[PDB]
Design a binder for these strands. Structure first.
Length: 254
DNA sequence: TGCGACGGTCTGACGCTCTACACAGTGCCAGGGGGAGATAAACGAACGCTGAACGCTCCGG
């Protein structure tokens, strides 16, 4: 609310496709139109040619004469957004005029870099506040209802980035002395995603000092059974090592 | 025709690499046909919405 300046046009990709024009919404339109606007939004303002956008929306088999289709999608964007916010060069399309804080993705990289800098500087309160602001950026599933295998690619990429971001958040929560909300979040995420080894290692680390041992190794045994049933291999050596040092109960990491 | 000499013609002129690089003085505008590119409509299909309807276990007086 403190960064809501006059004339600000805010764009959002981490949650669904929406536009905020000084507090009032804009109709982003068709799902393919939403995917087109998102594809322009991921490229931080390239002039990207018509064939590349056609491939981004659809992939291997776009209809043959659908170049005029993308043309009229561009017309839709130009009449629903500002005339000058979208400009065309040599047949390519480009959204400019994006200030700081206009895109939630740019704010996400900014907050991640600030958290990394604070971790390098050894600060904890400012980094915790930065990642608290960062976890409020995503709203539900990223890229809600957009077609295209391209959109699937940045969907899985942003999901993986969110996974490492929450891994770092939970890790600093564990090292600074937070366990209750930590184990709550880890249990919720392992309920959501059952086949991540790193989050279950985080479960072991969090429960190891919060006063919980039986269900931690029960969850580990369930992980071993599912990983043997679905993969039939052995887990990472760092895991077995973490369970090992746990077993002799070293109070060094208290 | 035989002679020389006069002449044009033509060719290469051992070998790689450590090295190795680029290149310059004098017109002008209007009219007109294409095609990319923005606009709003439009043909077609399916995607939602209306709860309704088929049918089971159900706690039940």
């Amino acid at each position: 609310a403190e960064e809501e300046e006059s004339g600000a046009l805010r764009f959002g990709v981490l949650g669904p496709v929406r536009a905020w024009r000084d507090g009032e919404t804009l109709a982003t339109g068709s799902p393919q139109q939403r995917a087109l606007l998102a594809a322009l939004l991921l490229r931080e303002g390239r002039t990207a040619t018509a064939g590349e956008l056609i491939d981004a929306l659809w992939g291997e088999e776009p209809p043959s004469q659908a170049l005029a289709a993308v043309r009229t999608y561009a017309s839709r964007l130009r009449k629903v957004l500002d005339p000058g916010v979208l400009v065309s060069e040599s047949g390519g399309y480009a959204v400019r005029g994006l200030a700081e804080g206009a895109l939630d993705l740019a704010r996400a990289q900014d907050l991640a870099s600030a958290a990394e800098k604070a971790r390098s500087a050894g600060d904890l309160c400012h980094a915790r506040d930065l990642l608290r602001r960062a976890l409020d950026l995503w709203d539900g599933e990223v890229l809600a209802g957009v077609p295209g295998p391209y959109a699937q690619t940045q969907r899985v990429r942003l999901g993986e980035w969110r996974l490492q971001l929450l891994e770092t958040r939970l890790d600093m929560d564990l090292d600074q002395g937070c366990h209750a909300e930590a184990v709550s979040e880890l249990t919720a995420l392992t309920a959501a995603h059952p086949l991540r080894e790193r989050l279950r290692e985080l479960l072991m680390l969090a429960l190891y000092r919060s006063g919980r041992q039986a269900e931690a190794l029960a969850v580990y045994a369930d992980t071993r059974r599912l990983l043997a049933d679905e993969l039939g291999v052995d887990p990472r050596p760092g895991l077995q090592e973490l369970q090992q040092r746990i077993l002799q109960a070293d109070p060094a990491l208290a």
